[PDB]
Protein backbone atom coordinates (compact mmCIF):
# COMPACT_ATOMS: atom_id res chain seq x y z
CA UNK A 1 0.00 0.00 0.00
CA UNK A 2 1.06 3.62 -0.52
CA UNK A 3 1.05 6.37 2.12
CA UNK A 4 1.60 10.14 2.13
CA UNK A 5 4.09 11.57 4.62
CA UNK A 6 3.78 15.33 5.09
CA UNK A 7 6.99 17.15 5.98
CA UNK A 8 7.32 20.50 7.79
CA UNK A 9 8.43 21.94 4.45
CA UNK A 10 5.07 21.15 2.86
CA UNK A 11 6.52 18.15 1.04
CA UNK A 12 4.59 14.94 0.38
CA UNK A 13 6.73 11.83 0.83
CA UNK A 14 5.16 8.88 -0.97
CA UNK A 15 6.35 5.58 0.48
CA UNK A 16 5.42 1.94 -0.02
CA UNK A 17 4.38 0.12 3.14
CA UNK A 18 1.86 -2.38 4.50
CA UNK A 19 -0.22 -2.72 7.73
CA UNK A 20 2.25 -5.41 8.84
CA UNK A 21 5.03 -2.81 8.79
CA UNK A 22 6.50 -1.33 11.96
CA UNK A 23 6.86 2.39 12.67
CA UNK A 24 10.60 1.92 13.21
CA UNK A 25 10.83 0.36 9.75
CA UNK A 26 8.79 3.16 8.19
CA UNK A 27 11.05 5.82 9.69
CA UNK A 28 14.06 3.83 8.51
CA UNK A 29 12.82 4.25 4.94
CA UNK A 30 12.41 8.00 5.46
CA UNK A 31 15.87 8.14 7.03
CA UNK A 32 17.45 6.63 3.93
CA UNK A 33 15.86 9.02 1.44
CA UNK A 34 15.58 12.21 3.49
CA UNK A 35 18.86 11.68 5.33
CA UNK A 36 17.23 12.52 8.65
CA UNK A 37 18.10 10.52 11.82
CA UNK A 38 15.21 8.27 12.98
CA UNK A 39 15.65 9.71 16.48
CA UNK A 40 14.51 13.12 15.26
CA UNK A 41 11.72 11.58 13.22
CA UNK A 42 8.42 12.03 14.99
CA UNK A 43 5.52 10.47 13.10
CA UNK A 44 1.99 11.79 13.57
CA UNK A 45 -1.33 10.27 12.58
CA UNK A 46 -4.29 12.66 12.71
CA UNK A 47 -2.82 14.59 15.64
CA UNK A 48 -1.79 11.42 17.46
CA UNK A 49 1.86 10.51 18.03
CA UNK A 50 2.94 7.11 16.71
CA UNK A 51 5.01 4.75 18.84
CA UNK A 52 8.11 3.29 17.20
CA UNK A 53 7.46 -0.08 18.80
CA UNK A 54 4.13 -0.52 17.01
CA UNK A 55 2.85 -1.56 13.60
CA UNK A 56 0.68 0.32 11.10
CA UNK A 57 -2.11 -2.13 11.91
CA UNK A 58 -2.00 -0.96 15.54
CA UNK A 59 -3.50 2.35 14.43
CA UNK A 60 -5.49 0.78 11.59
CA UNK A 61 -3.40 2.68 9.06
CA UNK A 62 -4.69 1.68 5.64
CA UNK A 63 -3.70 2.66 2.10
CA UNK A 64 -3.71 6.30 0.97
CA UNK A 65 -3.49 7.48 4.57
CA UNK A 66 -1.71 10.71 5.43
CA UNK A 67 1.07 10.66 8.01
CA UNK A 68 2.85 13.70 9.41
CA UNK A 69 6.56 14.03 10.13
CA UNK A 70 7.81 16.43 12.79
CA UNK A 71 11.53 17.12 13.03
CA UNK A 72 12.22 17.03 16.75
CA UNK A 73 15.63 18.53 17.39
CA UNK A 74 17.50 18.78 20.70
CA UNK A 75 17.22 22.15 22.41
CA UNK A 76 15.32 25.35 21.75
CA UNK B 1 3.08 44.42 12.85
CA UNK B 2 3.91 42.15 15.77
CA UNK B 3 3.44 39.03 13.67
CA UNK B 4 5.79 36.72 15.56
CA UNK B 5 3.80 33.76 14.23
CA UNK B 6 4.46 33.07 10.50
CA UNK B 7 1.21 32.27 8.65
CA UNK B 8 2.83 29.58 6.49
CA UNK B 9 4.28 27.72 9.46
CA UNK B 10 1.10 28.10 11.53
CA UNK B 11 -0.89 26.33 8.83
CA UNK B 12 1.84 23.71 8.48
CA UNK B 13 1.92 22.98 12.22
CA UNK B 14 -1.88 22.88 12.48
CA UNK B 15 -2.09 20.65 9.40
CA UNK B 16 -0.16 18.04 11.39
CA UNK B 17 -3.28 17.59 13.50
CA UNK B 18 -2.70 20.29 16.09
CA UNK B 19 -4.84 23.24 17.27
CA UNK B 20 -3.82 26.91 17.04
CA UNK B 21 -3.60 26.97 20.85
CA UNK B 22 -0.68 24.55 20.79
CA UNK B 23 1.02 26.57 18.06
CA UNK B 24 0.72 29.90 19.89
CA UNK B 25 2.05 28.57 23.21
CA UNK B 26 4.84 26.52 21.62
CA UNK B 27 5.82 29.47 19.43
CA UNK B 28 5.71 31.83 22.41
CA UNK B 29 8.41 29.86 24.21
CA UNK B 30 10.49 29.41 21.07
CA UNK B 31 10.22 32.86 19.45
CA UNK B 32 9.68 32.14 15.76
CA UNK B 33 11.61 28.88 15.62
CA UNK B 34 8.60 26.71 14.80
CA UNK B 35 10.95 23.79 14.23
CA UNK B 36 11.82 23.97 17.90
CA UNK B 37 8.20 24.78 18.71
CA UNK B 38 7.10 21.51 17.13
CA UNK B 39 9.83 19.77 19.09
CA UNK B 40 8.34 21.34 22.23
CA UNK B 41 4.64 20.77 21.55
CA UNK B 42 5.26 17.17 20.47
CA UNK B 43 6.73 16.30 23.89
CA UNK B 44 3.21 16.09 25.31
- CATH number of residue B17's parent domain: 1.10.8.10
The range of the structural domain enclosing residue B19 comes to 1-44
Q: Which residues pair with B43 in a beta bridge?
A: none
B12, B29, B30 ranked by CB distance to A8: nearest: B12
Report the residue count for chain A: 76
CA distance A48 to chain B (A): 7
Other beta carbons within 10 angstroms of residue B10's beta carbon come to 15
Helices (H), B1-44: 7-15, 20-28, 34-41
How many folded domains does chain B comprise? 1
For chain A, the residues whose C-beta falls within 8 A of a C-beta of chain B are 6, 8, 10, 42, 44-49, 68, 70-76
How is residue A14 annotated by DSSP?
Answer: E
Chain centroid, CA B17 distance in Å: 12
DSSP state of A31: H
Residues 6+ apart with CB under 8 A from A56: A17, A18, A19, A20, A21, A22, A23, A26
B42 touches chain A (CB under 8 A): yes
CA B43 to chain centre: 13
Q: Which of B39, B40, B42 sits opposite A49 (nearest CB)?
A: B42
Method: NMR
**What is the spatial order of strands in the sheet that A12-16 belongs to?**
A12-16, A2-7, A66-71, A41-45, A48-49
- Distance, first Cα to last Cα, chain B: 31
Amino acid sequence: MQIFVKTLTGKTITLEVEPSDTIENVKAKIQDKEGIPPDQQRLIFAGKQLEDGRTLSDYNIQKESTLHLVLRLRGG
Amino acid sequence: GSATFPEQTIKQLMDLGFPRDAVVKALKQTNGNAEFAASLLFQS
